[PDB]
Design a protein around this ligand. Structure first.
Ligand code: S34
Ligand code: S34
Length: 291
């Protein structure tokens, strides 16, 4: 699967909010383009003069993420975060020249991402009380990944001593994206666990944090909540469900070629971190069928 690379696989079946530190520093920002950020400004002007109702928004930037030694006490993960914008994204990762920017970053900084916006995404492997994962069908009219299968998520807009508020906003934002798009009540959702971080190689290597969230509703009840908002309540064009039993082999199905890079990251991390049992009982042949 060349379109997705794993940056991080969390231990312990996934990390809760209380085990994660962030460092939000301008040292973690994108570097100015070699010939100047006027190139980004020019692309933005062209876009606004065609679509004047567009607006900029701030985004978090992922610089790097360092896991503690496994088995340790205290904080288990440090996220090194900067700030970027939707404008900077459109001028870098989304640009036809994004591969040239990666090569220049390797040359100048020994960092393929140094000249890229790399806005941080969030997504969920969202499980039902009757053991299905939730999938969404993207509109064929949107700019990114038209017509492909996705999971719930997005690219959060901002607002350890400012760090803990940043970790709180990231965990809050994946629940808010589930409430906004799937139309579920907040009180039906578990506190999220971070499964890991995945890079989207079709979008010049931008990274997304992928979470596991449990819902106390059945698949039939989730479908009812999604549909009862009507066409204007969601950006997706449909909802569907796959048994957790069958997610195990999803990369061998015809569905795999329809999943956008976001969703593929979330399913690989769910299979490695929540699936793949380690103990004698769940690892027995009747419960973990060979092949
Ligand atoms: N920031 C960020 C990510 C993002 O906006 N995703 C896809 C996209 C949306 C609108 N136009 C082009 C591409
Ligand atoms: N490519 C693509 C679509 C996209 O970015 N969907 C939102 C998203 C879903 C899961 N993880 C992170 C972000």
């Amino acid at each position: 699967d060349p379109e997705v690379t794993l940056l991080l696989q969390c231990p312990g079946g996934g990390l809760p909010q209380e085990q994660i530190q962030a460092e939000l520093s301008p040292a973690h920002d994108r570097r100015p383009l070699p010939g100047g950020d006027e190139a980004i400004t020019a692309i933005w002007e062209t876009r606004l003069k065609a679509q004047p109702w567009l607006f900029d928004a701030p985004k978090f930037r992922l610089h790097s993420a360092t896991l503690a030694p496994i088995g340790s006490r205290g904080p288990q993960l440090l996220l090194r975060l900067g700030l970027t914008s939707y404008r900077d994204f459109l001028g870098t990762n989304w640009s036809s020249s994004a591969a040239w920017l990666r090569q220049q970053g390797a040359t100048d900084w020994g960092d393929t991402q140094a000249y890229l916006a790399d806005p941080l995404g969030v997504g969920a492997a969202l499980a039902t009380a009757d053991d299905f994962l939730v999938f969404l069908r993207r509109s064929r009219q949107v700019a990114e990944a038209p017509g492909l299968v996705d999971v719930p998520g997005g690219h959060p807009e901002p607002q350890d001593l400012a760090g803990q508020l940043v970790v709180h906003e990231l965990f809050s934002s994946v629940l808010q994206e589930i409430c906004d798009e799937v139309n579920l009540p907040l009180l039906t959702l578990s506190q999220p666990l971070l499964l890991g971080i995945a890079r989207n190689e079709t979008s010049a290597g931008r990274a997304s944090a992928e979470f596991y969230v449990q819902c106390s509703l059945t698949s039939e009840q989730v479908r009812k909540h999604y549909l009862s908002g009507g066409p204007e309540a969601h950006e997706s064009t449909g909802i569907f469900f796959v048994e957790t039993q069958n997610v195990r082999r999803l990369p061998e199905t015809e569905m795999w070629a329809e999943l956008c890079p976001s969703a593929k990251g979330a399913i690989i991390l769910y299979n490695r971190v929540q699936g793949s049992p380690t103990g004698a009982a769940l690892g027995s042949p009747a419960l973990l069928p060979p092949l």
